[PDB]
Amino acid sequence: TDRYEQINDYIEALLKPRPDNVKRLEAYAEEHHVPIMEKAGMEVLLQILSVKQPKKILEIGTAIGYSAIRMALELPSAEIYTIERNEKRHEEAVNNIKEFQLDDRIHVFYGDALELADAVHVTAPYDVIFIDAAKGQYQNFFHLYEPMLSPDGVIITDNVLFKGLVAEDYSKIEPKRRRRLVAKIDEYNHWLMNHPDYQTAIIPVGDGLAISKKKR
RNA sequence: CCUGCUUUGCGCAGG
Numbered sequence: 001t002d003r004y005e006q007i008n009d010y011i012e013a014l015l016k017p018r019p020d021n022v023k024r025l026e027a028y029a030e031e032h033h034v035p036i037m038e039k040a041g042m043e044v045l046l047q048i049l050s051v052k053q054p055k056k057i058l059e060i061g062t063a064i065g066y067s068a069i070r071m072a073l074e075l076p077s078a079e080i081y082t083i084e085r086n087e088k089r090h091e092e093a094v095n096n097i098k099e100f101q102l103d104d105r106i107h108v109f110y111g112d113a114l115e116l117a118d119a120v121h122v123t124a125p126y127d128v129i130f131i132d133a134a135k136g137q138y139q140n141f142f143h144l145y146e147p148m149l150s151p152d153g154v155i156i157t158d159n160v161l162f163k164g165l166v167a168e169d170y171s172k173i174e175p176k177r178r179r180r181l182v183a184k185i186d187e188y189n190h191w192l193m194n195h196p197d198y199q200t201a202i203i204p205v206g207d208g209l210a211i212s213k214k215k216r
Numbered sequence: 217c218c219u220g221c222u223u224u225g226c227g228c229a230g231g
């Protein structure tokens with residue numbers, strides 16, 4: 001283990017216990033290798049949300065519903081619109097949401113987010129947009145959905161550090177597919193951090209968070 | 217085998 005790992009493990013060990021039902025979702029994801037947000041990142045996301053107190057949240061990338069559920073439990077008034085392209089995950093998410101009795105406030109679209117803008121627009125604007133899908137597609141999601149953000153909204157992108165690979169010399173990573181993806185995330189970070197219409201900060205927690213707030 | 221897709225890490229589209 002290195003510093004980065006040790007720090008992550010230290011944070012996870014300081015966490016307050018989650019409710020048994022949330023614990024079941026975490027254990028399922030771990031058993032089944034469903035990617036779900038890492039624990040330390042999720043806590044930071046939640047705290048940012050608790051400060052902001054958004055009314056409406058758009059999430060790209062539901063998986064089995066874990067991050068949407070946690071957000072909704074943190075924000076009992078919020079409505080969440082989430083998108084998942086994998087039909088089996090979509091089904092699991094819907095079923096988990098129903099078990100938590102949150103289906104009145106969390107609504108899960110099936111399909112590729114790049115093809116669902118018209119649907120999502122019906123319930124725009126969103127005070128928070130959380131991008132948590134498809135490594136190679138962040139800029140595309142941003143351009144498609146940023147016009148739907150409320151005035152003082154925040155856009156949060158997950159997985160902007162790719163295990164630290166983005167911050168190293170990655171020029172000889174194999175296979176090439178992976179090298180190309182790391183380069184594409186590095187590109188996104190540079191593009192988004194340079195953007196004069198947003199104030200963005202990178203948070204090196206979990207897989208790395210970018211928090212972008214739209215200026216006036 | 218190699219190149220593109222998919223995946224958090226065997227099947228398509230090419231050479």
Ligand SMILES: C[S@@+](CC[C@H](N)C(=O)[O-])C[C@H]1O[C@@H](n2cnc3c(N)ncnc32)[C@H](O)[C@@H]1O
Pocket residue numbers: 035036037060061062063064065066067068083084085086089111112113114132133134137
């Ligand atoms: C890392 S996971 C989601 C983690 C989830 N937010 C959580 O913590 O509970 C990424 C998910 O995005 C979905 N996904 C990938 N590309 C997508 C796209 N273009 N549109 C919609 N969903 C997508 C995948 O099927 C996968 O379930």
